Paper text:
We have discovered, cloned, and characterized a fluorescent flavoprotein from a Geobacillus species that is homologous to other bacterial [name] enzymes. In the case of the Geobacillus-derived [name] homologue, FAD fluorescence is enhanced more than 10-fold, making this protein useful as a fluorescent fusion partner. We have named the novel [name] homologue [name], for Lucigen Yellow. In a physiological setting, [name] catalyzes the reduction of uridine diphospho-N-acetylglucosamine enolpyruvate (UNAGEP) to [name]-N-acetylmuramic acid via a hydride transfer from NADPH to the substrate through FAD.
Domain 1 (N-terminal residues 1–83 and C-terminal 297–302) consists of two α-helices and six β-strands forming a four-stranded mixed β-sheet and a two-stranded parallel β-sheet. Domain 3 (residues 235–288) contains a three-stranded antiparallel β-sheet and two α-helices. The binding-pocket of FAD is formed primarily by domains 1 and 2, with additional contributions from domain 3 and the loop connecting domains 2 and 3. One copy of the enzyme was observed per asymmetric unit, and the structure belongs to the trigonal space group R32. Interestingly, three crystallographic symmetry-related protein molecules formed an apparent fifteen-stranded β-barrel-like superstructure. Thus, we conclude that the fifteen-stranded β-barrel is a feature of the crystal packing instead of a true trimerization interface.
Residue numbers in the entry: 1 to 302
Write the structure that this text describes.
């Protein structure tokens, strides 16, 4: 990978960080080294990076805030592209917002709601990036990205860039086409909001932020909800009903207030988290005969 790293440095793509700990780049603050973590300074830099990747035929993964990732302790091979400050453009034109994939979702929800534009209040507590929200079809409070997205600009591995419409994104619960048929990087999105009375929109937005304070981790690092809900049961309630809140393995524990979040109490390894996940699964399978599946994404090594 030495030469991949070199070409990237020569292209001035932005930061080119060798053996970079993914613990620095995930909300749960866990994870080993990426061989090469690139932090592109702009959209062209992302294209330049992907072309190097294509040439040397190495592995790539795009990340935003790492808010749904449990990266394993031996990190990630190949190139990791973090979309962040280099891709944080944001412009409002009437009821349409055009926003780079690196922009903070919480920031967008906060500022857009303050403009009286309704449709992003639901996202005020989703601590990811726009590109990751598009990839995940992120959702809360009965809404999601699919309700407001007009189109998304995708960079494919082969270097082609294409605007996919809402329908072409094939959104469903926690799902988009980037996860399956058409993998690629979301560089930019156009979102459609609705102009309404500002104060009520701001209120809803803040209400949703308060909801996070009352029911979910604040003091400890954590990733997104761990398990899919085995409907009509909720994973969190099953875990709580089995008395596993606060249950600890190593530095990892089930949060004290929410059964579906594992927090990094301090010093947690990926192994701790994985063990905890398996232990919760065993416990719920024994008690309820339910096999729970992960929603949090496990990445690294393989
Ligand atoms: C406390 C907490 C609360 C959360 N609450 C919610 C919630 O209510 N609803 C919800 O849906 N999620 C929630 N999440 C999960 C997470 O915030 C979202 O899934 C978010 O959309 C992920 O963004 P990232 O930008 O954080 O993605 P990661 O950086 O976390 O990326 C996740 C996946 O998207 C891919 N990816 C990232 N960026 C791109 C890109 N630009 N192009 C293509 N692929 C990309 C990655 O490869 C990976 O597969 C929560 C997380 C935490 C920690
Ligand atoms: Cl950044
Ligand atoms: Cl906790
Ligand atoms: Mg240039
Ligand atoms: Mg027993
Ligand atoms: Mg029994």
């Amino acid at each position: 990978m030495d030469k991949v790293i070199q070409e990237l440095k020569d292209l001035q793509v932005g930061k080119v960080l060798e053996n970079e700990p993914l613990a620095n780049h995930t909300t749960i603050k866990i994870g080993g080294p990426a061989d090469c973590l690139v932090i592109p300074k702009d959209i062209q830099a992302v294209r330049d990076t992907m072309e190097v990747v294509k040439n040397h035929g190495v592995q790539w993964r795009a990340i935003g805030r790492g808010s749904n990732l449990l990266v394993l302790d031996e990190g990630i091979r190949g190139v990791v592209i973090k979309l962040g400050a280099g891709l944080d453009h944001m412009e409002i034109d009437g009821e349409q917002v055009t926003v780079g994939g690196g922009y903070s979702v919480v920031r967008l929800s906060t500022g857009i709601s303050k403009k009286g534009l309704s449709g992003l209040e639901f996202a005020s507590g989703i601590p990811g990036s726009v590109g990751g929200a598009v990839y995940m079809n992120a959702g809360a409070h009965g809404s999601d990205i699919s309700r407001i997205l007009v189109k998304a600009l995708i960079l494919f591995e082969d270097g082609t860039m294409e605007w996919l419409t809402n329908e072409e994104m094939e959104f469903s619960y926690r799902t988009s086409i980037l996860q399956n048929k058409r993998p690629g990087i979301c560089l930019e999105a156009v979102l459609q909001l609705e102009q309404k009375e500002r104060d009520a929109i701001v209120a809803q937005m803040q209400k949703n932020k308060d909801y996070r304070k009352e029911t979910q981790p604040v003091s400890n690092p954590c990733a997104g909800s761990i398990f899919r809900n085995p409907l009509p049961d909720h994973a969190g309630r099953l875990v709580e009903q089995a008395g596993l809140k606060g249950h600890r393995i190593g530095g990892a524990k089930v949060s004290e207030m929410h059964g579906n979040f594992i927090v990094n109490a301090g010093g947690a390894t990926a192994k701790d988290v994985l063990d905890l996940i398996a232990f919760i699964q065993k416990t719920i399978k024994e008690k309820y005969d339910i096999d729970m599946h992960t929603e949090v994404e496990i990445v690294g090594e393989k």
